[PDB]
């Protein structure tokens, strides 16, 4: 389904935008992968987000 | 004929170098052409060629900013080559020097750079500096970043980003070690011994291929503490120009 990466609270907090910025993270004047570096993703008190990309088992 | 004497330029342009008409003929250049000038150590930039009959044969005019950038003084010698391939910088980020923005208010960009970049086409390169006089004050700016790299021209198409922290002047030399052979005294034989074994394998690596030998790699310096061994190694590394770790 679309919500496994692109759904409600995925557009409110542009997880894709944050991911791309973290990948190309510099002042300097689309796919998400877990090979790179993390970036701070702070949300106020009382908010949960389960939209992180799935990985499935190891098979 | 790429070795010319240095002279104090009368004008107030940091990207203009004057040459004699005979010198211009020898270099096969034209008025307004951009040429690359290299000075002491591994510092070099690009300047707009200007015709100056008053200049004597084998002489050129460069302002104090260019001399500071090239780490040279009046009367020194530089190597000049044609630079016709210089392109236009599509996007450049430049930040002011902290000490030059002491209490200066208003849009520094429009106030200073905009008059200084109204179809000026001043060649720019990474790490260059230029001083612009606005109102009754003068503010310096540095080439923080340019695209395409490295050296290009700041034309109208260029997009200038003037957002960022002020460039404190002290850290350029306080936090960085730029020391050449001129900073070492009293040890010439040791310096020659180190150079003949460090630069030769790197600056001229094809000589050993021609003679079919493997030059020695390791080098162990020792002596009383405080004699400048670290300084000698730093100077050799800087003069060589190869990546230092
Ligand atoms: N030709 C020179 N010989 C010795 N010292 C010099 C010379 N030129 C400058 N100095 C100064 O002498 C001091 C040498 O300090 P430095 O720590 O580099 O020496 P060192 O004995 O090689 O160091 P160390 O063994 O602790 O790494 C510095 O102040 C340096 O500026």
Curated annotation (Swiss-Prot), chain A:
**What more is known?**
Present with 3530 molecules/cell in log phase SD medium.
* Job description of the protein: Functions at a post-ubiquitation step in the ubiquitin fusion degradation (UFD) pathway. Has a role in the endoplasmic reticulum-associated degradation (ERAD) pathway. Required for the proteasome-dependent processing/activation of MGA2 and SPT23 transcription factors leading to the subsequent expression of OLE1. Has an additional role in the turnover of OLE1 where it targets ubiquitinated OLE1 and other proteins to the ERAD.
Assembly behavior: Component of the heterotrimeric CDC48-NPL4-UFD1 ATPase complex. The CDC48-NPL4-UFD1 ATPase complex interacts with the HRD1 ubiquitin ligase complex composed of the E3 ligase HRD1, its cofactors HRD3, USA1 and DER1, substrate recruiting factor YOS9 and CDC48-binding protein UBX2. Interaction between the complexes is mediated by interaction between CDC48-NPL4-UFD1 complex member CDC48 and HRD1 complex member UBX2. Forms a complex composed of CDC48, NPL4, UFD1, DOA1, SHP1 and deubiquitinase OTU1. Interacts with NPL4, CDC48 and UBX2.
Shown portion of the whole protein? 230 to 310 of 361
Which family is annotated? Answer: Belongs to the UFD1 family.
What is the gene name? UFD1
> Can you name this protein?
Ubiquitin fusion degradation protein 1
UniProt lineage: Eukaryota, Fungi, Dikarya, Ascomycota, Saccharomycotina
From Swiss-Prot, chain B:
Where is this protein found?
Answer: Microsome; Endoplasmic reticulum; Cytoplasm
Residues where ATP 1 binds: 225-231
What else the UniProt entry mentions is: Present with 78400 molecules/cell in log phase SD medium.
| The protein's assembly and partners | Component of the heterotrimeric CDC48-NPL4-UFD1 ATPase complex. The CDC48-NPL4-UFD1 ATPase complex interacts with the HRD1 ubiquitin ligase complex composed of the E3 ligase HRD1, its cofactors HRD3, USA1 and DER1, substrate recruiting factor YOS9 and CDC48-binding protein UBX2. Interaction between the complexes is mediated by interaction between CDC48-NPL4-UFD1 complex member CDC48 and HRD1 complex member UBX2. Forms a complex composed of CDC48, NPL4, UFD1, UFD2 and SHP1.
* Family classification: Belongs to the AAA ATPase family.
Its annotated function is as follows:
ATP-dependent chaperone which probably uses the energy provided by ATP hydrolysis to generate mechanical force to unfold substrate proteins, disassemble protein complexes, and disaggregate protein aggregates. By recruiting and promoting the degradation of ubiquitinated proteins, plays a role in the ubiquitin fusion degradation (UFD) pathway. Has a role in the endoplasmic reticulum-associated degradation (ERAD) pathway which mediates the cytoplasmic elimination of misfolded proteins exported from the ER.
- Name of this chain's protein: Cell division control protein 48
* Portion of the full sequence shown: 33 to 277 of 835
């Amino acid at each position: 389904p679309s919500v496994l990466g692109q759904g409600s609270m995925s557009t409110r907090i542009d997880y894709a935008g944050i991911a791309n910025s973290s990948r190309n993270k510099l002042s300097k004047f689309m796919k998400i992968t877990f090979d790179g570096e993390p970036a701070k993703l702070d949300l106020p008190e009382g908010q949960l987000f389960f939209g992180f990309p799935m990985v499935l088992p190891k098979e | 004929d790429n070795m010319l004497l240095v002279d104090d330029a009368i004008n107030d342009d940091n990207s203009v170098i004057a040459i004699n008409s005979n010198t211009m003929d020898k270099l096969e250049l034209f008025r307004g052409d951009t040429v690359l000038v290299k000075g002491k150590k591994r510092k070099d930039t690009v300047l707009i060629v200007l015709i100056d009959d008053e200049l004597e044969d084998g002489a050129c005019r460069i302002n104090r900013v260019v001399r500071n950038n090239l780490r040279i003084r009046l009367g020194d010698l530089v190597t000049i080559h044609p630079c016709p391939d210089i392109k236009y910088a599509t996007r450049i980020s430049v930040l002011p020097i902290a000490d030059t923005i002491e209490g200066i208010t208003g849009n520094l960009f429009d106030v200073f750079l905009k008059p200084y970049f109204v179809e000026a086409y001043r060649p720019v390169r990474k790490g260059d500096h230029f001083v612009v006089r606005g109102g009754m004050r003068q503010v310096e700016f540095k080439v923080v970043d340019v695209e395409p790299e490295e050296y290009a021209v700041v034309a109208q198409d260029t997009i200038i980003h003037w957002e960022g922290e002020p460039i404190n002047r002290e850290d350029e030399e306080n936090n960085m070690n730029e020391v050449g052979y001129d900073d070492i005294g009293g040890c010439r034989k040791q310096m020659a011994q180190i150079r003949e074994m460090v630069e030769l394998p790197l600056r001229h690596p094809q000589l050993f291929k021609a003679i079919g030998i493997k030059p020695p790699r390791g080098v162990l310096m020792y002596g009383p503490p405080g004699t400048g061994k670290t300084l000698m190694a730093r100077a050799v590394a800087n003069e060589t120009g190869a990546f230092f770790f």
